[PDB]
Enzyme design. Structure first.
Site, mmCIF file in Angstrom:
data_model
loop_
_atom_site.group_PDB
_atom_site.id
_atom_site.type_symbol
_atom_site.label_atom_id
_atom_site.label_comp_id
_atom_site.label_asym_id
_atom_site.label_seq_id
_atom_site.Cartn_x
_atom_site.Cartn_y
_atom_site.Cartn_z
ATOM 1 N N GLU A 4 54.830 32.933 2.552
ATOM 2 C CA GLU A 4 55.010 33.068 4.018
ATOM 3 C C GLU A 4 53.654 33.323 4.677
ATOM 4 O O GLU A 4 53.371 32.770 5.750
ATOM 5 C CB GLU A 4 55.953 34.231 4.293
ATOM 6 N N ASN A 41 56.896 28.477 16.388
ATOM 7 C CA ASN A 41 57.982 27.506 16.084
ATOM 8 C C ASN A 41 58.193 26.546 17.264
ATOM 9 O O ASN A 41 57.810 26.863 18.384
ATOM 10 C CB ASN A 41 59.235 28.249 15.666
ATOM 11 N N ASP A 57 60.798 25.797 18.841
ATOM 12 C CA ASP A 57 61.772 26.374 19.813
ATOM 13 C C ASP A 57 61.088 27.418 20.707
ATOM 14 O O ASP A 57 61.788 27.932 21.620
ATOM 15 C CB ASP A 57 63.020 26.891 19.089
ATOM 16 N N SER A 100 59.909 30.355 19.641
ATOM 17 C CA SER A 100 59.877 31.644 18.898
ATOM 18 C C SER A 100 58.594 31.662 18.046
ATOM 19 O O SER A 100 57.920 30.658 17.864
ATOM 20 C CB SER A 100 61.096 31.884 18.053
ATOM 21 N N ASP A 138 56.831 33.577 14.424
ATOM 22 C CA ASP A 138 56.966 34.351 13.172
ATOM 23 C C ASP A 138 55.760 35.273 12.964
ATOM 24 O O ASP A 138 54.627 34.832 13.168
ATOM 25 C CB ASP A 138 57.055 33.438 11.960
ATOM 26 N N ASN A 143 60.931 36.406 12.485
ATOM 27 C CA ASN A 143 61.000 35.577 13.698
ATOM 28 C C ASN A 143 61.482 36.362 14.912
ATOM 29 O O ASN A 143 62.397 37.191 14.814
ATOM 30 C CB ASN A 143 61.887 34.396 13.378
ATOM 31 N N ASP A 146 71.968 40.563 6.054
ATOM 32 C CA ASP A 146 72.633 39.850 7.187
ATOM 33 C C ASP A 146 73.703 38.872 6.685
ATOM 34 O O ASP A 146 74.586 38.519 7.500
ATOM 35 C CB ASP A 146 71.596 39.115 8.048
#
Ligand SMILES: [Cl-]
Ligand SMILES: [Cl-]
Ligand SMILES: [Cl-]
Ligand SMILES: [Cl-]
Ligand SMILES: [Cl-]
Ligand SMILES: [Cl-]
Ligand SMILES: [Cl-]
Ligand code: NA
Length: 129
Positions: free
Chosen positions: A35, A46, A48, A50, A52, A59, A101
């Site tokens: 990562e 990203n 969209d 967003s 990270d 995110n 999650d």
């Protein structure tokens, strides 16, 4: 901060990630390597809009507030900047919420594609833990 491999394994074990939700320490080190290359200051934007953040590229769409991700949540209740600290506490505490999650470590696409099913114990081999 750029961690060393064993330095990061030790820091993650001290913060209770080894076997957290059944994932052995090498899974967490492998995810961090791919990562962020072990750099707490890593950021990536990203498509969209967003972003990270940090050693586990958490995110802003769901997990932290950066004030520039419209309609997003802040489920870890932290500013995304906390995730860039030399002190991994905020990244670790948020990763514990993410891996709880429902999809486990599949939440980390680099872990699914590069770590899952591999010899992840190699990532902690030799370390004094
Ligand atoms: Cl390495
Ligand atoms: Cl392991
Ligand atoms: Cl926002
Ligand atoms: Cl929220
Ligand atoms: Cl905030
Ligand atoms: Cl730390
Ligand atoms: Cl799982
Ligand atoms: Na957010």
């Amino acid at each position: 901060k750029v961690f060393g491999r064993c330095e990061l394994a030790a820091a993650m074990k001290r913060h209770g990630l080894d076997n957290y939700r059944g994932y052995s320490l090498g899974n967490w080190v492998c995810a961090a390597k791919f990562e962020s290359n072990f750099n707490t200051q890593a950021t990536n934007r990203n498509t969209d809009g967003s972003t990270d953040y940090g050693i586990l590229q958490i995110n802003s769409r769901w997990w932290c507030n950066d004030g520039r991700t419209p309609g997003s949540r802040n489920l870890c209740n932290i500013p995304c900047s906390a995730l860039l600290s030399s002190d991994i506490t905020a990244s670790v505490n948020c990763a514990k919420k993410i891996v709880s999650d429902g999809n486990g470590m599949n939440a980390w696409v680099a872990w699914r594609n590069r770590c899952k099913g591999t010899d992840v114990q190699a990532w902690i081999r030799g370390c004094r833990l």
